[PDB]
Design a protein around this ligand. Structure first.
Ligand SMILES: NC1=NC(=O)C2=N[C@H]3C(S)=C(SO)[C@@H](COP(=O)(O)OP(=O)(O)OC[C@H]4O[C@@H](n5cnc6c(=O)[nH]c(N)nc65)[C@H](O)[C@@H]4O)O[C@H]3NC2=N1
Ligand SMILES: NC1=NC(=O)C2=N[C@H]3C(S)=C(S)[C@@H](COP(=O)(O)OP(=O)(O)OC[C@H]4O[C@@H](n5cnc6c(=O)[nH]c(N)nc65)[C@H](O)[C@@H]4O)O[C@H]3NC2=N1
Ligand SMILES: [Mo+6]
Ligand SMILES: [O]
Length: 779
């Protein structure tokens, strides 16, 4: 048995594992990581925890009746252990049956999910590689993060904007005077990366504090970001930020302070927005006093902030929770409109940034080459012969349940109309839709429309519990791979070396799909005749050839593997100022919009005629909001990202002990809201609305503003009885309470943070938690 140390990486960072007698016993952070995540211990534990999936399993009802199975019992845990050969034959037969019977429109292969980093063991791309060989599939478009903002931004500034490099951190330290974190908690959200994180925001935040820059945080919760800077903290009722921005803009116009020259030379449509702002069109001037009535933030505070932003070099760093809500397109559109009025876009340290809280945006980029990985093969094919009838080949990701309930119905998306395909099978790997998707009770019923649901994972998540066929995948730690360090920085390339042998009967997703492709008669097409190290070397060699041409020297493959990492030099990346070339010469460097300027009024959007996405930023009432006219429930749930999980990842580990309250997901509640209900710190409470009911454990704190409770997304749904409509969730999955609706007809994004509910002390029968131990038959 092996004894020694091995370096690898993950969504949480680079680390060194200690291995004793073939078992990983500790993960120690990379010595060069400026701010390791405390979650690393849970990553190690996830390899061995009680919910690790040991063997391939098939749901008993599905095994016995196939398409005639009772589908209401999915999730009850009645599984049968089968051999790998039996499972692979069945998965291949089902994929082929569905493709032959229903066509490519019958298979949903969007499989949204965060999976694990790695250029070879990319489970969702490998899934689509196999489904391409099987005949095709329906895919998903966009994501759950910036579903609204990524669609409105191309109409406003010309590009996606949310996933683009930001003005460098060092430029902010030397030039910014006022830093605003609007709906962003960078200390919490910068712990992880899509590719391996370099944790570059932490040194950046520390430099701002050492310089004494004024920091303002606009968030309903007193976060660690507020505490680290001792920031001025503004707490709006959730979903009212657009009203606040309009009050600020109105103030700038009324006091004649705004930058008329910036507006005249770099924007289009401000003259069509002015009448709305002044209330000529609806008899309602959008003053600071009007904004106070909706948001609860004092009118004078709104005015003083507006004046301060106009007189100092200000950076508006906005997060994405405020666009993960009804009419979410308006939030960043109005932010850019306000930023345009301030006139600092393109100046060092001024303007706005939509990725300072995510994956190190702002960390100086290196001059290194880009690393490529395995593909789905789609770009060198001739896929399905598709056409309306049979439905669209792609749907916005959050419309997956609408699709299942309404096959053949039309839907709007960014100016086009399409039809939902009639899906009969879904194959999900590296994702947890039974935690990440909204309105769990609606979804549970809608899933009965699928004949077959196949899942690969290494943990017994609610999604794996609901599958017809469950196959145990390996973790990154049981295989080899290669990946970039730094989504924006491109700090280097890491060898993700194998640490331990595969546990139990787990297999890589690559091996699983290669075996399914073999049963479809397409084995060589899937593998390309390469094995694990052959694939990895080919990606490295391609990057090295690209680096060579650019003047960046890289070692030969075996020398790189022996060192375990290669780092690239920073040349001019530390001086990057976003929008500087546009500001310098807008005629020579125009934006990719119809006019070449920032579009405050969009003629393109006006022509779509969508009632829920007007042609300029507009305040509209959402489905439900805190203190809204005729609102039924009294508390808004800040259903935001977890501090000590990456979504659902790591819920079934030792880390849960540190935050669970009587075994349930924690619920933060203000003292006054707790006192009114006779709730004490530590009590188990039932949180409910018209869509569902869940149990959580309360922590009383004035960190949340009055009227708001915090229940993070990611809790593992643990239904009392799967056959009972609206059954109580015993653990605390906040998506049992959210609504499943589109942000608007423009983007069709999810509204995961548009949620109101009531809370009462739970006095019902004692409940037993069953989500953190494997199903009995799977032991
Ligand atoms: N109410 C809500 N509020 C929100 O704010 C909210 N956030 C969104 C967002 S923003 C996202 S991501 O853009 C989704 C994340 O859902 P996801 O299914 O990616 O969550 P994970 O808990 O990270 O599921 C990943 C899944 O994958 C497994 N896995 C890891 N590596 C592998 C592998 O190599 N092979 C396989 N087969 N599986 C792997 C993990 O174990 C894990 O189970 O959430 C939205 N919802 C929100 N709602
Ligand atoms: N530790 C950690 N866990 C994760 O799960 C995680 N997920 C990653 C991913 S996939 C994403 S897409 C990003 C998400 O990055 P995103 O900015 O969407 O993060 P959230 O935690 O949903 O919201 C950030 C802040 O917005 C505040 N907020 C909520 N509603 C409102 C509102 O109406 N107005 C205002 N002004 N503020 C509001 C919340 O209180 C919270 O502090 O984080 C990434 N980083 C992550 N880190
Ligand atoms: Mo996301
Ligand atoms: O994401």
């Amino acid at each position: 048995l092996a004894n020694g140390t091995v370096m690898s990486g993950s969504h949480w960072g680079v680390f060194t594992a200690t291995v004793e007698n073939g078992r990983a016993t500790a993960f120690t952070p990379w010595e060069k990581d400026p701010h390791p995540s405390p979650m690393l211990a849970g990553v190690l534990d996830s390899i061995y925890s009680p919910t690790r999936i040991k063997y391939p399993m098939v749901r008993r009802e599905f095994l016995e009746k196939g398409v005639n199975a009772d589908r209401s019992t999915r999730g009850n845990g009645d599984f049968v252990r089968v051999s790998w050969d039996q499972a692979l034959d069945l998965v291949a037969a089902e994929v082929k049956r569905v493709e032959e019977t229903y066509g490519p429109e019958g298979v949903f292969g969007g499989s949204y999910g965060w999976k694990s980093p790695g250029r070879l063991h990319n489970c969702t791309t490998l899934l689509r590689r196999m489904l391409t060989l099987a005949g095709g599939y329906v895919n998903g478009a966009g994501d759950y993060s910036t579903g609204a903002a990524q669609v409105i931004m191309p109409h406003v500034v010309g590009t996606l904007e949310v996933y683009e490099q930001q003005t460098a951190w060092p430029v902010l330290a030397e030039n910014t005077e006022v830093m605003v974190f609007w709906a962003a908690d960078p200390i919490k959200t910068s712990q992880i990366g899509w590719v391996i994180p370099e944790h570059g925001a932490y040194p950046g935040l520390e430099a701002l504090k050492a310089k004494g820059t004024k920091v303002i945080v606009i968030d309903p919760v007193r976060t660690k970001t507020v505490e680290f800077f001792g920031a001025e903290h503004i707490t709006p009722k959730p979903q009212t930020d657009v009203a606040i921005m309009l009050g600020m803009a109105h103030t700038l116009v009324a006091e004649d302070l705004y930058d008329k020259d910036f507006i005249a030379n770099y924007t289009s449509g401000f003259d069509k927005f002015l009448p709305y702002l002044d209330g000529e069109t609806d008899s309602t001037p959008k003053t600071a006093e009007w904004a106070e009535g909706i948001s609860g933030v004092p009118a004078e505070t709104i005015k003083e902030l507006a004046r301060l932003f106009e007189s100092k070099r200000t950076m508006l760093a906005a997060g994405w929770s405020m666009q993960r809500m009804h009419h979410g397109e308006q939030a960043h559109w109005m932010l850019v409109t306000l930023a345009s009025m301030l006139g600092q876009i393109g100046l060092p340290g001024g303007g706005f940034g939509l990725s300072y809280h995510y994956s190190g945006g702002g960390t100086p980029s290196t001059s290194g080459p880009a690393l490529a990985g395995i593909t789905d093969g789609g770009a060198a094919t001739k896929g399905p012969e598709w056409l309306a009838a049979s439905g669209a080949s792609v749907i916005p990701v959050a419309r997956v349940v609408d699709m299942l309930e309404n096959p053949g119905a039309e839907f709007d998306f960014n100016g086009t109309r399409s039809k939902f395909p009639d899906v009969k099978m879904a194959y999900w790997v590296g994702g947890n839709p039974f935690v990440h998707h909204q309105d769990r009770n609606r979804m549970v019923k809608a899933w009965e429309k699928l004949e077959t649901f196949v899942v690969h994972d290494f943990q017994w998540t609610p999604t794996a519990r609901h599958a017809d066929i469950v196959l145990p995948a390996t973790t990154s730690y049981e295989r080899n791979d290669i990946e970039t360090i730094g989504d924006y920085s491109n700090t280097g390339i890491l060898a993700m070396k194998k640490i331990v042998e595969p546990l139990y009967e787990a297999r890589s997703d690559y091996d699983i799909f290669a075996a399914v492709a073999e049963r479809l008669g397409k084995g060589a097409e899937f593998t390309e005749g390469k094995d694990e190290m052959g694939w990895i070397k080919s990606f490295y060699d391609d990057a090295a050839k690209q680096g060579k041409a650019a003047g960046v020297q890289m070692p030969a493959f075996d020398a790189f593997w022996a060192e375990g990492i290669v780092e690239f030099p920073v040349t001019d990346g530390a001086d990057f100022v976003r929008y500087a070339s546009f500001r310098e010469d807008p005629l020579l460097n125009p934006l990719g919009t119809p006019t070449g300027l920032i579009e405050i009024y969009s003629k393109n959007i006006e022509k779509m005629g969508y009632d829920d996405c007007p042609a300029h930023p507009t305040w509209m009432e959402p489905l439900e909001r805190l203190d809204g006219p005729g609102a039924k429930y009294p508390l808004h749930i800040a259903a935001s990202h977890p501090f000590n999980r990456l979504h659902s990842q790591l819920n079934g580990t030792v880390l849960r002990e540190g935050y669970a309250v009587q075994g349930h997901e924690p619920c933060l509640m203000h003292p006054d809201d707790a006192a009114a209900r006779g709730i004490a710190d530590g009590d188990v409470v039932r949180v409910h609305n018209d869509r569902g009911q869940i149990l959580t454990g309360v922590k009383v704190t004035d960190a949340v503003m009055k009227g708001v409770i915090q229940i993070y997304e990611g809790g593992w749904y643990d239904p009392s009885d799967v056959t009972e409509p609206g059954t109580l969730d015993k653990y605390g999955d906040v998506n049992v309470l959210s609504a499943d609706i589109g942000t608007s007809k423009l983007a069709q994004g999810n509204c995961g943070q548009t949620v109101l509910a009531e809370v009462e002390k739970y006095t019902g029968p004692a409940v037993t938690l069953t989500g953190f131990v494997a199903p009995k038959a799977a032991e």
